[PDB]
Symmetry: D2
Subunit: 100 residues, 4 copies
């Protein structure tokens, strides 16, 4: 199989960084990706290990950035059995495209 | 902004083709994309116009195929207000990789 | 087959736009793409029709830009028969990533 | 900067594997990538370390394969000063798309 996603958009918020209790670092943030048009997809990005550290250190709300990684579909069933699932890019790389 | 997805996986089912009542053709199907490992993401693909016709004509359950397109997050609120959303690739191209 | 290239780098020069004598517009320019490190690949980009008009109108030396397109290997033999060939990306899209 | 290439085509020959005298493994091979049409680009692929071992072990002339990596422009001047350069994809991944 093969799975590759490339995105350029703006962070909607500061990245949120936590250490899940196994001792690994996770950073998430959300990219506003216009369809250009007024329509927008807001896509959750997830960074791990060193790439999480980087995102924490250098990304802020409003920053334009390139992310490549893989599409991951996070599935779960409710108590009642109704299916819910979340979409995430697991970042392989984060590239700055402006200066600040 | 920029939005590009490349996938290779197998159709889990025959593609479903309907003409939404505006007179446009839509074909959907679902790609099993392993993470290779036993874990798998099942990703809905959506084709439109000529690419819908192609998918209808030449794709069948189990076929390996490459799709490129764009990640689209289909959002909606329930009667009760609880947020639900669906993930879809709007295909730009479909490429055969085997013979059959 | 499948052929897709994504690049982000800076124009080394203003784009050069000519109408080849068949009545089609061609714009070329060269992207400095670091390997980041001090090493750099300088890659010729070629735009056609409306995308040539765009490149002409909005790109200038030093501008950061994203290009996707296809790798094309332009081959030729000299008078003496020695093989020469050139590499080019035929752009499908050009995306601004900064403001100016 | 950012540099990503995705290709699907057939090997024109068996891969050639040598250990350059520094103790690293290099495998090369050439992908026939149609433009589909009768026109074709033949693109040199270069694999290193474990990915070189893989290419050696599992790729053969005529095999369909997906490669992602980065465009590298290998430059050199002749004794006489005339510029020559070669194009290569440095593979990040090699993915089988058929069974054999």
């Amino acid at each position: 199989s093969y799975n590759k996603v490339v995105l350029v958009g703006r962070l909607t918020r500061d990245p949120e960084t936590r250490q899940t209790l196994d001792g690994n670092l996770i950073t998430t943030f959300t990219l506003a990706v216009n369809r250009g048009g007024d329509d927008v997809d807001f896509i959750r990005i997830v960074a791990f290990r060193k790439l999480a550290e980087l995102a924490h250190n250098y990304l802020q709300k409003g920053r334009m950035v390139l992310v490549d990684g893989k599409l991951r579909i996070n599935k779960w069933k409710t108590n009642d059995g109704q299916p819910r699932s979340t979409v995430e890019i697991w970042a392989d790389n984060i590239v700055f495209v402006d200066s600040k």
